[PDB]
Ligand binder design. Structure first.
Ligand SMILES: O=[S@]1OC[C@@H]2[C@H](CO1)[C@]1(Cl)C(Cl)=C(Cl)[C@@]2(Cl)C1(Cl)Cl
Length: 272
């Protein structure tokens, strides 16, 4: 029940997602692994310990490596998973950049609104992709042969980002709804340094209209009443999570440098 332009819009986004999302993480390799001012630390202490994960690697031969992280003993132990996380983030960010670049609506913006929309939304698009491999019953992100298992209840969902992943997973969205959420978020007319506000705003309104129409054509069940409005509220939450994670990343980077070159680009760090 979508117009021809709407069906075209979904097809192009589904196509860009198919070409740039390595859902089995086959091409993520060469990554680092964990080895074998007072109020600043307390804040970074608080920052890192809210999402503790164990790590699993399944070998191509049938072997398994498992990593249980240290307990908080007040020292540098809390940074042991950071270089690995930054390699995963970088790998995810590359996929996200390729996603934007293959979308015609994105390619037709000026190069400096592109860079500035990407800086605004890279974390949000990455979290949206990670929700699709998140297993809410085991508390696990299943990334191919890599697994990231949350670490022992519902106090765990006090961390807003964990609560976001569980709430988003409960809506049981289709692939099309996920990519439309990525578009609406990528084309946010109000990111720092956007110049073509009006063009980006019309594109966004239009990805939103397609999503509302998609839901109305394909989900008549009483369970998905107001589903479109739940998605828009989740996007608002994610924008907020996104700003909190940016501050926390800069606080950590301030006392313990870890960001990759691509992360420095996306987050304003100049290397000087
Ligand atoms: O790409 S980055 O590195 C991956 C980590 C974070 C996202 O940023 C979180 Cl929040 C998510 Cl999502 C996953 Cl998956 C993990 Cl493992 C946790 Cl720590 Cl749960």
């Amino acid at each position: 029940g979508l117009t021809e332009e709407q069906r075209m819009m979904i097809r192009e986004l589904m196509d860009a997602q198919m070409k740039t999302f390595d859902t089995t993480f086959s091409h993520f390799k060469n990554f680092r692994l964990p080895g074998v001012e007072a109020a600043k630390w307390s804040q970074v202490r608080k920052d890192l310990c809210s999402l503790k994960v164990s790590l699993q690697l399944r070998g191509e031969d049938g072997s398994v490596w498992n990593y249980k992280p240290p307990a908080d003993s007040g020292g540098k132990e809390i940074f042991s998973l950071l270089p690995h996380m930054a390699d995963m983030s970088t790998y995810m960010f590359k996929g996200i950049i390729s996603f934007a670049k293959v979308i015609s609506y994105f390619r037709d913006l000026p190069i400096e609104d592109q860079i500035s929309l990407l800086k605004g939304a890279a974390f949000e698009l990455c979290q949206l992709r990670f929700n699709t491999v998140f297993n809410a019953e085991t508390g696990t992100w299943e990334c191919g042969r890599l697994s990231y298992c949350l670490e022992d209840f519902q106090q765990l969902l006090l961390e807003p980002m964990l609560k976001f992943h569980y709430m988003l997973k409960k809506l049981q969205l289709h692939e099309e709804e996920y990519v439309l959420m990525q578009a609406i978020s990528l084309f946010s007319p109000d990111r720092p340094g956007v110049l073509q506000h009006r063009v980006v705003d019309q594109l966004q309104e239009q990805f939103a209209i397609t999503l509302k129409s998609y839901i109305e054509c394909n989900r008549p069940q009483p369970a998905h009443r107001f589903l479109f409005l739940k998605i828009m509220a989740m996007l608002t939450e994610l924008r907020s999570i996104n700003a909190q994670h940016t501050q926390r990343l800069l606080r950590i980077q301030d006392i313990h440098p870890f960001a990759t070159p691509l992360m420095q680009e996306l987050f304003g760090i100049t290397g000087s």
